[PDB]
Structures are given as structure tokens and as C-alpha cells.
Amino acid sequence: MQLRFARLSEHATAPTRGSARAAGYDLYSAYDYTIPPMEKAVVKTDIQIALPSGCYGRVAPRSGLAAKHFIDVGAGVIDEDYRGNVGVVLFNFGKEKFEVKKGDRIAQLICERIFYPEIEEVQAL
Amino acid sequence: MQLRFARLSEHATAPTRGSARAAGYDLYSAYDYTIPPMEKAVVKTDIQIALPSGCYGRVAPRSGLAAKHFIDVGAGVIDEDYRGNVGVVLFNFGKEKFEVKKGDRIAQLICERIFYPEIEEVQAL
Amino acid sequence: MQLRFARLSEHATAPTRGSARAAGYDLYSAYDYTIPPMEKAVVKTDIQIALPSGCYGRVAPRSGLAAKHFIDVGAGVIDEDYRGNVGVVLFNFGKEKFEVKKGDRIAQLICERIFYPEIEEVQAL
Ligand SMILES: CC(C)(CCCOCn1ccc(=O)[nH]c1=O)NS(=O)(=O)c1ccccc1
Ligand SMILES: CC(C)(CCCOCn1ccc(=O)[nH]c1=O)NS(=O)(=O)c1ccccc1
Ligand SMILES: CC(C)(CCCOCn1ccc(=O)[nH]c1=O)NS(=O)(=O)c1ccccc1
Ligand SMILES: [Mg+2]
Ligand SMILES: [Mg+2]
Ligand SMILES: [Mg+2]
Ligand SMILES: [Mg+2]
Ligand SMILES: [Mg+2]
Ligand SMILES: [Mg+2]
Numbered sequence: 001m002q003l004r005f006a007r008l009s010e011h012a013t014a015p016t017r018g019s020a021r022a023a024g025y026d027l028y029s030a031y032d033y034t035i036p037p038m039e040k041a042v043v044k045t046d047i048q049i050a051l052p053s054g055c056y057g058r059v060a061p062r063s064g065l066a067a068k069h070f071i072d073v074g075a076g077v078i079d080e081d082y083r084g085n086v087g088v089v090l091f092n093f094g095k096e097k098f099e100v101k102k103g104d105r106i107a108q109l110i111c112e113r114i115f116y117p118e119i120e121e122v123q124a125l
Numbered sequence: 126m127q128l129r130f131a132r133l134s135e136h137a138t139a140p141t142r143g144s145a146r147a148a149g150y151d152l153y154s155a156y157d158y159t160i161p162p163m164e165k166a167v168v169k170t171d172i173q174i175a176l177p178s179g180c181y182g183r184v185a186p187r188s189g190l191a192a193k194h195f196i197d198v199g200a201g202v203i204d205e206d207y208r209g210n211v212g213v214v215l216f217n218f219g220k221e222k223f224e225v226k227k228g229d230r231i232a233q234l235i236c237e238r239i240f241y242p243e244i245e246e247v248q249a250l
Numbered sequence: 251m252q253l254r255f256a257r258l259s260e261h262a263t264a265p266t267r268g269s270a271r272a273a274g275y276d277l278y279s280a281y282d283y284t285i286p287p288m289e290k291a292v293v294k295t296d297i298q299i300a301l302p303s304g305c306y307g308r309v310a311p312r313s314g315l316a317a318k319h320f321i322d323v324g325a326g327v328i329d330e331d332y333r334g335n336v337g338v339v340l341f342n343f344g345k346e347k348f349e350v351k352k353g354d355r356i357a358q359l360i361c362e363r364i365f366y367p368e369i370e371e372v373q374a375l
Contacts, residue, residue: 003242006249014246021206023181023239038343042317050250052242056273056360066200066214067167074316077358081271083250089317091343093163093216108202110181111240114273115302115361117253121264124256125300125333128367131374139371146331148306148364175375177367191324192292192339208375218288218341233327235306236365 003111004050008085012046013103024060024108027088033100035092040074042087043106051080055111059088062108070094073107128236129175133210137171138228149185149233152213158225160217165199168213168231176205180236184213187233195219198232251302253361258335262296263353274310274358277338283350285342290324292337293356301330305361309338312358320344323357 003025005015013028030046051057057078065071074089088107092098100106128150130140138153155171176182182203190196199214213232217223225231253275255265263278280296301307307328315321324339338357342348350356 001240001242002245004245004247004250006247015244017244019204019206021241022204023202025244040317040320040343048250052240055240060202061200063200063202063214067165067212070165070199070216072199072216074320074322075311075313076316077273077310077313077360079269079272081269087317089313091320091322093165093218093343110202110237111242112360113238113240113363115305115363116271117251117302117361119265119267119275120252120254122254122256125254125298126365126367127370129370129372129375131372140369142369144329144331146366147329148327150369173375177365180365185327186325188325188327188339191326192290192337195290195324195341197324197341218290218343235327235362236367238363238365 001052003052005047007047009046011102015109024110026105027059027107027109029100029102029104029106031102035090035098037092037095037097040089040091042089043100045086045088047086048083049086052111055113056080058110058112059107060110062105069098071098126177128177130172132171133173134171136227140234149235151230152232152234154225154227154229154231157227160215160223162217162220162222165214165216168215168225170211170213172211173208174211177236180238181205183235183237184232185235187230194223196223253302254300255297257297259296261352265359274360276355277336277357277359279350279352279354279356281352285340285348287342287345287347290339290341293340293350295336297336298333299336302361305363306330308360308362309357310360312355319348321348
């Protein structure tokens with residue numbers, strides 16, 4: 001039932017959630033990145049996570065980066081069994097480069113509840 | 126279990142959902158906006174919402190605006206305890222300006238079920 | 251319940267999920283498409299789906315197409331009662347054209363659990 005994580009390097013920061021009813025934990029960059037205009041980057045967090053059973057982890061955008069700096073998050077579907085280093089794919093749609101520094105919050109991680117259905121083909125629904 | 130909302134000005138339109146089984150309620154703009162090509166705008170609904178317990182409110186794209194006009198929704202994670210004016214971050218990736226008129230539907234609001242886990246750091250998963 | 255689907259033409263490919271704990275089933279293009287830089291396309295799968303009760307179907311990005319080729323998915327909210335041809339709205343934000351060949355996996359379908367709340371207006375929350 002808890003979200004567990006481990007730091008893969010000392011550059012990682014433990015994810016935080018200030019409000020008890022916020023949808024997501026903050027994810028912090030482990031490194032500095034410069035993302036030119038209309039360009040993408042995979043920002044490494046250097047953490048691995050073990051999500052609660054019954055959800056996947058969605059890497060979702062922070063609201064202020066989106067509205068103020070035209071930053072979006074691509075990809076974003078972390079499967080329940082993924083134990084690698086969590087990467088945030090950021091898209092910079094703004095006309096200026098966007099700087100990430102180590103320790104900056106750059107996305108949030110949401111435990112999205114889903115079904116894992118078996119699939120069946122039929123002739124017509 | 127219901128979704129409650131209040132109008133913050135008389136320009137607001139109550140969200141609607143025509144089908145009992147549609148994923149989202151329609152969100153309507155409270156104002157006119159002109160969003161140039163490759164630009165973004167924060168479109169105010171002038172409503173506040175109180176989402177049902179156990180979900181967050183995802184502001185998600187309308188399907189036709191995306192396929193027909195290349196409009197996408199940025200940000201989009203409204204925490205369950207957010208009581209301010211609901212804003213829709215629209216991105217216009219088309220080659221022509223996109224007009225929003227007051228009263229237009231410009232996104233949909235989905236009650237996405239999530240866990241709110243506690244977090245635990247371990248040395249290694 | 252299960253996810254049922256039917257092929258609407260012989261060009262469709264049954265969706266697949268390699269891992270038991272992957273969040274989504276891969277969706278396959280039924281046709282070739284060439285998506286120029288900064289353009290979008292509606293890629294038809296020629297399948298119809300019947301999603302389990304209690305979810306909508308989100309068309310979500312494949313992680314590799316996003317990080318390696320700057321491909322994103324627009325629209326993406328398939329209501330639980332939709333019985334038409336599933337279309338994937340791909341956005342190519344890359345500097346080079348992106349080729350979809352028939353039979354290529356171009357998105358994933360996630361059964362995102364949601365509430366279907368009734369709506370109530372109040373004077374102020
Ligand atoms: C094996 C792949 C496809 C996925 C590896 C990461 O899988 C987990 N995962 C999935 C989505 C995501 O956004 N972040 C993340 O950490 N490699 S990659 O294309 O280079 C890529 C790296 C980081 C983030 C997204 C994609
Ligand atoms: C305090 C902030 C970060 C968020 C205030 C709104 O938070 C609730 N919220 C969150 C996501 C969203 O898409 N819409 C919304 O109404 N301010 S802002 O950057 O200007 C911004 C306003 C509207 C939408 C997105 C961002
Ligand atoms: C009636 C419409 C609005 C929606 C018809 C498809 O509704 C189901 N649906 C919804 C979201 C989605 O991404 N794919 C999909 O198949 N027509 S359309 O704008 O041309 C469009 C077609 C395919 C995908 C997105 C949009
Ligand atoms: Mg170092
Ligand atoms: Mg700023
Ligand atoms: Mg997006
Ligand atoms: Mg139109
Ligand atoms: Mg969800
Ligand atoms: Mg490739």
C-alpha cells in the first residue's frame with residue numbers, strides 16, 4: 001500500500017508531497033539540463049520506485065511549468081513492475097531554452113488506478 | 126460521491142455530460158481568447174469544483190479539437206482539495222490561430238481514481 | 251471483466267500486452283502513414299473495443315517513440331461506450347518525418363478506473 005523508492009545515486013532527492021490530498025509526489029531532477037526551444041530531454045531522477053498494487057505510475061506535468069514556461073511531459077506510463085531509474089521526458093515548447101538544475105521539481109508521479117484485463121477477440125461487438 | 130461546483134462569475138457555464146457513460150464533464154470557457162499558432166493560453170472557466178473523494182480531476186483534451194485543430198491540453202492535474210478557479214491550459218500546435226469564444230467547450234474533466242500512498246525510502250528495491 | 255475487441259477489417263492486428271503487469275495493451279496501425287515534422291495524423295487501428303465497466307480507455311504514448319522520436323499522443327479519451335473504429339491521434343514534434351508502417355505499434359490502451367459522478371451546483375464551496 002505504500003509507495004517505496006530507493007536512491008540510485010547521491011544526486012537523487014526523495015520525492016515529496018506537501019499536501020495530504022495532492023494527486024502526485026514531486027519528482028526532482030538529479031542533474032542540470034538545458035533544453036533548447038522545441039526540444040525534448042530525458043531528465044534522470046536517479047530513483048527507482050515500487051508502486052502499490054493496482055496502479056501504474058503516471059509521470060504528469062507540474063501546472064506552473066506548463067502555464068508559465070510551456071513545458072510538457074511526454075511518455076509518462078511507468079509500468080507497475082518497472083524497477084529501473086525513473087526518467088522524465090520533458091518537452092520544451094517555449095521559444096526560449098529551459099534550464100533544469102539538480103534539485104528542481106520537474107514533474108509529479110501519480111498512482112493511477114487501472115484494471116489489468118485479459119483480452120478476448122470476438123467477431124463483432 | 127457527486128461532483129459539486131459553484132460559479133465564480135456569471136460568465137461561467139455549469140459543466141455537462143450528455144452520455145451517462147462518458148468519461149468526462151465538458152468544461153466551458155468563461156471568456157473569448159485568441160491563441161496564435163504555437164502558443165498557449167490559460168482559459169478560465171470561472172468555476173470552482175469539489176471532486177468526490179478517492180480521485181483527482183484531470184483536465185483532458187476534447188477529441189475533435191485535437192484531431193481537427195491540433196489543440197492539446199497542458200498541465201491538467203487538479204488536486205482533490207483545489208478550490209480556486211479551474212483553468213484549462215490549451216496549447217495550439219496548429220499553423221493557424223485558434224479562437225475560443227465564451228461558452229465554447231474546450232476540455233473535459235475526468236474523475237480519475239488514484240491511491241494516496243505514504244512514501245517509504247529503502248536502501249534498494 | 252475482460253477487454254473484448256473485434257477487427258473491423260483484416261488490416262487490424264489483435265492488441266498485445268507482453269508483461270502481465272504492463273499498464274496498457276499495444277495498439278497497432280492498420281495502415282501506413284507518413285507524419286511530417288510538426289504535424290499530426292489520425293492513425294486508424296480498424297478495431298472496436300468494449301472496455302470493462304468502471305474505466306475509460308486512455309490512448310497513451312509508447313515510451314520509446316516519445317523519448318527517441320519526439321512522438322506524442324493527442325486526444326486519447328475513449329468513453330466506455332464507444333464502439334467505433336479506435337483512432338490514435340499522433341503528434342510528430344520532431345525535426346524529421348515519422349513513418350508509421352501498417353502493423354507498427356503506435357500507442358498503448360490503458361483501462362483507467364474512474365468515477366461517473368452526478369453533478370450538483372452549490373452557491374459557494
Ligand atoms: C526502454 C525505454 C523505452 C523506457 C525506459 C523507462 O521506462 C520507465 N519509464 C516509462 C515512462 C516514463 O516516462 N519514464 C520512465 O522511467 N527507453 S527510453 O525510451 O529511452 C525512455 C527513457 C526514460 C523515459 C522514457 C523513455
Ligand atoms: C498556482 C498555479 C501553479 C496553479 C493554479 C491552478 O491549479 C489548479 N489547476 C491545476 C491544473 C490545471 O490544468 N488547471 C487547474 O485549474 N498557477 S498557474 O501556473 O498560473 C496555472 C493556472 C491554471 C492552470 C495551470 C496553471
Ligand atoms: C467524433 C470524433 C470527435 C471522435 C471519434 C473517435 O472517438 C473515440 N476516440 C477518442 C479519443 C481517441 O483518441 N481515439 C478515439 O478513437 N471524431 S474525430 O475527431 O475525427 C477523431 C477521431 C479519432 C480520434 C480522435 C478524434
Ligand atoms: Mg555526479
Ligand atoms: Mg517560472
Ligand atoms: Mg501532452
Ligand atoms: Mg472544428
Ligand atoms: Mg487514471
Ligand atoms: Mg526508433
